[PDB]
Amino acid sequence: APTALERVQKEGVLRVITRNSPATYFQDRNGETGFEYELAKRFAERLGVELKIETADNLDDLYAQLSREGGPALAAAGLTPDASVRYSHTYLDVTPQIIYRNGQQRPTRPEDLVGKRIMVLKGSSHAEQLAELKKQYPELKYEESDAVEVVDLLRMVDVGDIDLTLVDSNELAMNQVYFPNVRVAFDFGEARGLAWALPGGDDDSLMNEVNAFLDQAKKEGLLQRLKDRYYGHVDVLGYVGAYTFAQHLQQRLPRYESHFKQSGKQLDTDWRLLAAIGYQESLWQPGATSKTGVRGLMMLTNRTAQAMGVSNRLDPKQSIQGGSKYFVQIRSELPESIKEPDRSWFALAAYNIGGAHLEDARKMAEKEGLNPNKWLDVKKMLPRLAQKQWYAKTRYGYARGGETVHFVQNVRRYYDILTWVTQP
């Protein structure tokens, strides 16, 4: 008579069903990832079992697998919370948002959905929301598809195939950086928690382990660290900066993508990181120049150019080649036991602020009894290079070490964003 929990533990596998969606589960360079994947993999680790993911064709399929004997133990799928289905405690507050196309008539309230072409996923809480609206306004028309994901409905608004969709704010935020013409019209409802779904029944053995995991996850910052990483683009970049990234990805990157990729091949370095640097430096503009005679797409000094054999810094190919050689060389000089990924984040700090001021920040880390080989500690020190109190105590004095923390954070975020929609 094994409980749900004992079943898992005896099989030594946790089978989780999810959506095929950026917001939940997909693959990158290093394998499986995504918010729900990472969250569910820490749950399987907690239980001491192997995670096995299944994906459903659509939401009705996903809820049908859960009600099957022998099916998945739980669904982790950005689900908005029937004896056939039980929900965990909620783990993230998301708001349903009506999405429209920039430059078209912004709907401001529910009645404005009438006369608009509107599609949502079949079997979704979105479709239920609309079903309730239609009882009030019979003239409301909307279509449901079970052949599409949410990212695909956002693309339909983006390219103009539909006027409107309804989507959770965390999904909007994640994908706002890819669709330059989608905008939030308004919030169709207030924030509400997402929850994992479990098979119905009277056995609360796994449900209680799920809820203790989510409790822990909130306690330690795990949910918020995952949310900032995948869903945090608008909070960190601003709304305008996130959609502007979409513009520049669609209209600028294609002119340089192959340059970036050749460099990556040449230097055995992920090309999306190199493109991320270019984005943070110039917004992928070959002509950009600064005050201090640093220029071109990657922002190279004349020395760097000379050292790197770059004739013309206004040539993008050239600037990318030398910028990317220079990043990789900086990264190579760092002390050998500093490992990836920190190795790369230190290299990004150095690219921006230069080896000297970095060294001072690492020394300051050590004098504070923090670790100078630990990125997070050195990060804590860098902003101090701009505070008088602390740059007084440094060999090379004042530097814009707050800008440097922003540069590393953004490059990391841009790199993520490019990774999730491009090939290695």
Ligand SMILES: CC(C)[C@H](N)C(=O)O
């Ligand atoms: C899955 C998504 C579309 C939404 N949260 C829902 O539960 O239907």
